[model samples]
Target: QPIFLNVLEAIEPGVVCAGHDNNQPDSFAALLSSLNELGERQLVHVVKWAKALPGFRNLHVDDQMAVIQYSWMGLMVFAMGWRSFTNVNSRMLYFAPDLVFNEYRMHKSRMYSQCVRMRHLSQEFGWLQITPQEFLCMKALLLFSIIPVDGLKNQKFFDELRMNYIKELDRIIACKRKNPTSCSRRFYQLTKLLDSVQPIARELHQFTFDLLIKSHMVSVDFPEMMAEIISVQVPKILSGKVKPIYFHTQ
Candidate 1:
């Protein structure tokens, strides 16, 4: 019972800060700029944690890197939703220890609609009464949630891994309910929550693509890694080369 969960808890990243400076005015430009820097730091930790997950390295070499890169945005945003729910009770967007987004910051981020949509995600964590163990399985599944339609170097292994996570999630759901219908509905609801994640990441992907191409004219400064992540795989995502696996037809 503890085996997979032990791995999940162990591999989960520790707290990361956005390194926002309170002394300076938190302008729109500065906030976005700081969050970009924040992302770079998290990337280092994310890669470290990714390799540590059980069976993660069973993936073929090329697919390993690609999956991690593809999953990057969803992983960050999904977990940040948890952080916001856990820490602030969903009252605000918590990007990191020092980089919480308030109403003004949300509006200033120039993605006001996206912010509220994200906050909706955070609120659902409590609404559904999602347990920590369930969160771990859901979070682990994020790595397998999206891929290129062209497929991976070992798509077979990808299939096996995704199935294993789904199986694990089912196991988690079954224990909580005596009624089969309740369990099925619970599973459905959780997948619905998981499916909701991609559009938010997609919106950010769109925003970043434009922000970087016009980086010279914009107040937001893209770090080298951030610039490259935007320049590369995202185009395929926007072009429909990459696709997320939705449990529903969505």
Candidate 2:
């Protein structure tokens, strides 16, 4: 029972926890604090800028919602995972991207960047900053690693989690091949799910990388990325078709 529950829990929010007190150890507010500082700053400042950017405002309402929602979720998951790696041991970050200053300041901190030299977190902290190429080398680890904990020692759970999702996807594709005449709604649903699931899963992937694989890893730009995740369209099978439920009385 617990195993099945865990499987379902992995896919969706916990039903019982829905009503539970959120102020405990894993409270929502606490989770928010665990977010990357740059991500948090961007969420506060950059997201509004993204929305107001001339081209961005022209998107359909649903698409806009999708992008924002997925981006927020992704950033949080990535930050949660990365925050798990900040101890007093590691150090070395030469040849990484230079931290830009007031070139991008918030409304409140217009003068601060000019006055204070910007610094990369990795350099500010002790860890040897991985260069872009080294960072790419580690991307696989960031993309696939699972969030680790004491009792839940199966550190490979993230990879297995993704593999299981892909397996289910393959099973579904095979089923579709066997049932080529499947209705339009089925295709629409499947396509919609496929479009939405990746960013959500990617968010989890990023989180597991940060918090579990390497907490010192810090390049998280959530709100900006959110714009990309939800913009893609699904089959849109129901876009212009609606079945009548009843005759009009008037």
Candidate 3:
């Protein structure tokens, strides 16, 4: 338990859940800046954590980028869920307590629906009594997802890494229950939680894209890395309605 506590503490320094108060700026521009700053910070820390994993650092640089870019949103969701569970009244998921935004704010930004869906999923994760071991394993699984990303010459290497993490997760799950059926059920349910992340990530990407196009001001306001990670499509508003303008990057 000390090891888990230590690991959690070491990585979570400077992390805080936030609210909209006089202590923090409440303007839309200010909120966007906070979210971008917090998201970039968390992504950096999570990348560092992943790289410290035994096999991760040895991977090719391109593979490393592929994994991190592909997994960034999932890692964010995982961390947010883990942190949200720690607070009894976590009405809004907080990347940092100082950067928190509620469902109302999310709705105003057109992210309300995705936010609610993940809120339910995160609540379910809380009720499942997830262990720190499982949490770490899930993070690895999220990062080592090689199926979606292309150009991993040593894809099998990361595949093996994922399998090892899954095995450890299963071992942990198996020990937690006397009934094999219950353990199996929990394993599937938890795995399904990962499945829930993809759609929400897509929604968040769309919202990010929308933010990019809502005004030319956001081009300067939003973080470039966050924008590129989403591989945002340009939006065109025509005939008093928003239209889609898709762009593919090589």
Candidate 4:
């Protein structure tokens, strides 16, 4: 009798799914609006990251957006010189004194002499300052833009976005040529880079870019994708004995 009473009570109001009906429409609409806003927010985030990409950042905002819409990763990889040059390490040189010149003043004067000698030696033999900080900056410049492909509704929309940018680039290039001084050197370089990045604009139809080398059109494994990209590039940055740290352990 109590079970039936409870069931009836839930079926009517103030209980179970039935309790949600009073303002369900508003609640649902608000949730949907929040989701839409979230999507727009994510898109802006993707764009911001694309603009923040190293060499790509130097380009115009519209071009940056175009690249992000296209092959965001490829453009990022190409820019910032892509590991072309690196400065030498500073502390790699030997600083300790090998032999003392005088035993009389070993504590103070001799130590000072060794320090002066080390300084002179460093001035002549020390390598250029290639701190790990700059190496990190190089490491950071290598990523491709990642888009959440899980709920992405369409692939053609992505393609069209890129094409539209290509069209815009073409129009800009034409106008600049026609009206020579209308823009500055900044104009040509920006449009040119956009044109160059147009080809490898891989159309990520689904979860491929966001996931591992998957076998589907949906769902994301963001962690796996990040891992694979990092693994592939690790050797380029690592030295004879040095290795990258995986923060996942911490």
Question: Model 1 compared with the native: what TM-score?
Answer: 0.97
Instruction: Give candidate 3's whole-model lDDT.
Output: 0.61
Candidate 1 local Cα displacement, residue 229, angstroms = 1.0
lDDT string, candidate 3, 1-250, tens digits: 4343345445543464332343743455556656666666676677777766656767777677767776666668776877777664446766576555576556544456877876776686667777766776676667664234233667667667767667766876775478778987888877877666666665665666667666376532556676666542222111212221111111
Worst 10 residues of 2 by lDDT: 241-250
Candidate achieving higher TM-score, 2 or 3: 3
RMSD of 3: 7.0
Residue 72 lDDT (model 3): 69
TM-score of every prediction relative to native? 0.97, 0.22, 0.78, 0.24
Which of candidates 3 and 4 is the stronger one according to TM-score? 3
Greater TM-score among 1 and 4 belongs to 1
Which residue pairs in candidate 4 collide? 73-144
Candidate 2 matches the true fold with a TM-score of: 0.22
Candidate 1 has an lDDT of 0.90
Give Cα-based local distance difference scores for all models: 0.90, 0.30, 0.61, 0.31
Q: Is candidate 3 or candidate 4 better by lDDT?
A: 3
Number of clashes in every candidate structure?
Answer: 0, 17, 8, 1
Candidate 4 lDDT tens digits, 1-250: 3332232223221101111122333332332223223333333444554444334444445444433443333333232112212212122212112111123322322133433333332232123222232223222222222223331234345444444434433443444244556444434434333233222223211213323334133222233333343334322222212121221221
Superposed on all Cα atoms, the candidates' RMSDs to the truth, in angstroms, are 1.0, 21.8, 7.0, 26.0
Indicate the TM-score of model 3: 0.78
